[PDB]
Structure 1
Amino acid sequence: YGRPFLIIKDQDRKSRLMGLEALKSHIMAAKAVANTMRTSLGPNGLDKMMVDKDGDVTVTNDGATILSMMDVDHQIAKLMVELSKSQDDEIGDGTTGVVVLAGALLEEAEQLLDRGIHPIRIADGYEQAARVAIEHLDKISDSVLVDIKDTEPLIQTAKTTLGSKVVNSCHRQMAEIAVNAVLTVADMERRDVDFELIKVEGKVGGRLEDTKLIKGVIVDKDFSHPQMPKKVEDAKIAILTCPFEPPKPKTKHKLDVTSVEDYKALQKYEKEKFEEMIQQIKETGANLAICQWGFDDEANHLLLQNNLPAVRWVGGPEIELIAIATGGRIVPRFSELTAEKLGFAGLVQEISFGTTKDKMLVIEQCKNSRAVTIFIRGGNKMIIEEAKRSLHDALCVIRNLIRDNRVVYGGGAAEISCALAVSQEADKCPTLEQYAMRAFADALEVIPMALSENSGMNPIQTMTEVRARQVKEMNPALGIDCLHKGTNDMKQQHVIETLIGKKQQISLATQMVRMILKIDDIRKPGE
């Protein structure tokens, strides 16, 4: 009969929301995230500042970072958070709007729900709309496969990708900075490139323009001995792991000295060993040495005693960056090193980069080197940090471009044609997916509206004209005059973007919102 009973512990504090009310609730939450992000897109967009739990701060425009820093409590939000994280490491920016695509779709999706329309079909049509989008998109897609050595399609694309970031001050340079960086380290034979070959190095100070990529490697280490000369012209290089001390077999090992002569020979050997390897490197004919591990102060001077500067306590990854950039090897032994394994470079010089600080070491290698570093200088730590991520992201899309050399002029023209392309199908749709079509098409429309609103112009007066031209004309190359240039030919405006970027973007979005539509009920534990 009627009387209380326990099914789940804490049944009192097990709250539960089901069905449409839960559905809209998530939609309400979704829009907040959307409205959170709308301002973050586009050259006229404005970026956000996050404050760390340990009190640190971060200003940024990369929404992935924004959400990564974001601490929500609503679960669906976290899905959005990782969603952007999934998109970023997948492609990169576009994250500038990726979530914004989702929620507005969800916002209008509820409009269908307000029409009582069941999510399952709503899941259905939008996906079909998604497939519709891509096959339209790639049809009207341009390509940079057709291009000669791709010097300045990429520069434009880099120029495009950096107009969303505050580093746009001298972004032309950084556009060049990346393109040189990537082309050097690219495997056209592979269509891939490892970002490890790229060494980001940003030290605060100087102007942004002082940011300078380095065809080589820079070391956050000074000289092993202060008297060692700061510059070195020739670059006969030694790359060492075994620290300059008595070798010690790491199995439990110990000697048991007994007599006088026992002491002396070891004492005798103690120096004798140092001369040996001191001889050993000298016989190799190298000019400079570098060690991962420690030195003995004695042999260090002795190493200084033969004008062979070395570097001590060098972090792992960089050493190989040194090795490969030099083409050099890594020898664990004194005896087994030969001149052939020695690294060579164009120039190595420590830099007293700081006015009042300890210094840095740079290697201006002059031959070919599959690894490279970029040096960033600028006025603020966060400004460095913004640059790194911005610079970091710009690399990917060119890498992304390496995978696919077919792109589209950006600026909002692309998807605009799609909804029109979508809409044209919506007449041959038949039923209720017919409503589903215009819904998503209407959903897709927001991104330009985001732009022009961030452009401060009338969003709708803009796109309505924008459509009609792309309605009147067949050229899908008319976006938003973001920087107030009376030409909608973004192709001439050179605002361009890789096919995949959007292609993965919306395709990613569809699947997420599918799950978003897919759920009805939640049981939240009381905190």
Structure 2
Amino acid sequence: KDQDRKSRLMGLEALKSHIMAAKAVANTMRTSLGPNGLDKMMVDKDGDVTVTNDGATILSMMDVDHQIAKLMVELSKSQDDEIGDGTTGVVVLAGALLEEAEQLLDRGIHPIRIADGYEQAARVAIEHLDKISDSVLVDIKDTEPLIQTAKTTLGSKVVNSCHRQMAEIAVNAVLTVADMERRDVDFELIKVEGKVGGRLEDTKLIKGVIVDKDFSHPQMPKKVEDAKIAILTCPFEPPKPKTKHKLDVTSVEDYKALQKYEKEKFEEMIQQIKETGANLAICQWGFDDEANHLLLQNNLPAVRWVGGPEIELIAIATGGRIVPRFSELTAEKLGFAGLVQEISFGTTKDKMLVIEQCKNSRAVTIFIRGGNKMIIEEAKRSLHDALCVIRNLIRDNRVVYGGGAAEISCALAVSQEADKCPTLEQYAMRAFADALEVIPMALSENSGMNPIQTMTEVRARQVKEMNPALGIDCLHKGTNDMKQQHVIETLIGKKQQISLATQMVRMILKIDDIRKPGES
């Protein structure tokens, strides 16, 4: 049904319409490339304002209606776990590949020759990256050059003023939850929380689990050195339901009887913590005033009003289990911790619970601070980009010089190997060499320099001067050769940037018909 009111696009003009749907996405994000990338204003659906230039926030928030532009949204679900640094880089690469393919479509070449020709030239550019890559941590492990490379990818944003102490934190967080010889870094084992107030220098590395809940009473001790934590859902008190107790009393004969019936329950379940051997009582609900007076005398602290996901996040790090009531209390499901402390922040009444193990754990949490809440969500993503580069260093310590140095040397090898291809895929190989030069050309355009004058000077430098590649001066430094300026990208991040860009042009050029049924 519904044949009337249906948009159709077929013929040769549907091929250029899919190019124009992809050219609108690339031209917006060719200005936000590099550390000198221009900011983007985001207007929320309810009226909030948040400004950023990150690539992963652009693709997730751009409510596009074209299905060709919706295919550009799909690459962000798999790229942020792989490269983390070239989200703006693959969009301009997929767009500029279709720019020269728009010129190739005027000649009459079929897109199944262009999609196969782009896959042919991508294997030459991938092979050229492995020949020019240099190692860092071959045959040994070291933590000193890993912080220097992490200082460059972190300081590309506004958090460059405190990039030193935050780069040492992300190195020790990955090395605790994961080993370098195992090469299995888990992103779910590293959590990042934050609260308003303070500076960026007050970032502390908590090896364990943090929850934003205080103790059940202000007279509770703030130091638990014993590794026995009972995590339950019902507090050690007379039993109350989940929503509303609503105890009915008739007269003073029922109030006197229910008080003695509650005084037995106030004496039993409080002393039921000592028969098992637990010290901390993390319960989902709070405690009463009569229970808090008894917890002070027996030296047993407790955490009140712990939320839904806050319970399960503690028991994974400490190795505990969600206990439903007091009858299932065993010593095997009790949590383990080295230091449970409460840390306040000035006059703020947050008083979060800091559970530390004081050892090499398997779940580490990072608490960042700042003067505004928009900087805390920016610094969380800033450390998340730093976690992927260290993850790429563990899987492969070989690295390649970024900042346009790897892109120009790849364009020289592809154009040299294009003459050895005596078929109709030769024009697609020369198309791949021209689109590879656009990413270092957009780097110099965002820096305020002439884009063509800056590009061809490195062409005479990477050929006539020296065979090692030289970078493009993007941060207005003294000279070229960004290897001396310590701006180096990863090899896996540069190989998958080429492969994902070829994958999206192959899926776009093969699509030649769209049918959109409207309303009836």
Pair 250,241 (structure 1): closer, same or farther in 2 beyond 3 Å? closer
Offset from partner CA, 1:175-220 (integer Å, 9 cap, x none)? 2221111111114453222222222111122223333332333221
- Higher mean alpha-carbon deviation, 121-130 vs 409-418, is at 409-418
- Counterpart contact for 1:303–1:309, Cα < 8 Å: yes
- Rounded Cα–Cα distance in structure 2 between residues aligned with 1:407 and 1:453: 26
Pair 325,11 (structure 1): closer, same or farther in 2 beyond 3 Å? closer
Offset from partner CA, 1:380-413 (integer Å, 9 cap, x none)? 2222111112222321232233333322221121
- Counterpart contact for 1:143–1:406, Cα < 8 Å: yes
- Counterpart contact for 1:218–1:363, Cα < 8 Å: yes
* Structure 2 partner of 1:18: 10
- Distance apart, 1:115 and its partner CA: 2.1
SS at match of 1:89: coil
Pair 253,169 (structure 1): closer, same or farther in 2 beyond 3 Å? closer
Pair 502,315 (structure 1): closer, same or farther in 2 beyond 3 Å? farther
Pair 521,326 (structure 1): closer, same or farther in 2 beyond 3 Å? closer
- Counterpart contact for 1:236–1:288, Cα < 8 Å: yes
- Counterpart contact for 1:236–1:343, Cα < 8 Å: yes
Pair 429,63 (structure 1): closer, same or farther in 2 beyond 3 Å? same
- Counterpart contact for 1:235–1:348, Cα < 8 Å: no
* Structure 2 partner of 1:436: 428
- Distance apart, 1:33 and its partner CA: 0.9
Query: How well do the aligned residues superpose, as a CA RMSD in angstroms?
Result: 3.6
- Distance apart, 1:516 and its partner CA: 0.8
Pair 24,249 (structure 1): closer, same or farther in 2 beyond 3 Å? closer
Offset from partner CA, 1:156-193 (integer Å, 9 cap, x none)? 33223223322222122222221111111114453222
Q: 2:288 aligns with which of 259, 283, 296?
A: 296
- Distance apart, 1:455 and its partner CA: 1.6
Q: 2:194 aligns with which of 185, 188, 202?
A: 202
- Counterpart contact for 1:64–1:81, Cα < 8 Å: no
Pair 252,383 (structure 1): closer, same or farther in 2 beyond 3 Å? closer
- Distance apart, 1:154 and its partner CA: 2.4
SS at match of 1:203: strand
Equivalences, count: 519
- Rounded Cα–Cα distance in structure 1 between residues aligned with 2:240 and 2:302: 22
SS at match of 2:176: helix
- Distance apart, 1:125 and its partner CA: 0.6
Pair 247,192 (structure 1): closer, same or farther in 2 beyond 3 Å? farther
Pair 458,266 (structure 1): closer, same or farther in 2 beyond 3 Å? same
- Distance apart, 1:321 and its partner CA: 4.8
Pair 240,143 (structure 1): closer, same or farther in 2 beyond 3 Å? farther
- Distance apart, 1:291 and its partner CA: 2.0
- Higher mean alpha-carbon deviation, 93-102 vs 19-28, is at 19-28
- Rounded Cα–Cα distance in structure 2 between residues aligned with 1:307 and 1:317: 27
- Higher mean alpha-carbon deviation, 359-368 vs 441-450, is at 359-368
- Distance apart, 1:151 and its partner CA: 1.0
- Rounded Cα–Cα distance in structure 2 between residues aligned with 1:26 and 1:49: 26
- Distance apart, 1:122 and its partner CA: 0.8
- Counterpart contact for 1:205–1:377, Cα < 8 Å: yes
Offset from partner CA, 1:64-102 (integer Å, 9 cap, x none)? 221111111222111111223331133322103221110
- Higher mean alpha-carbon deviation, 310-319 vs 363-372, is at 310-319
SS at match of 2:124: helix
- Higher mean alpha-carbon deviation, 65-74 vs 9-18, is at 9-18
- Rounded Cα–Cα distance in structure 1 between residues aligned with 2:179 and 2:325: 32
Runs of 5+ in structure 2 lacking a partner? none
Offset from partner CA, 1:37-90 (integer Å, 9 cap, x none)? 112221111232312112223322321221111111222111111223331133
- Counterpart contact for 1:487–1:493, Cα < 8 Å: no
Q: 2:236 aligns with which of 216, 235, 244?
A: 244
- Higher mean alpha-carbon deviation, 342-351 vs 202-211, is at 342-351
- Rounded Cα–Cα distance in structure 1 between residues aligned with 2:458 and 2:66: 37
- Rounded Cα–Cα distance in structure 1 between residues aligned with 2:353 and 2:47: 32
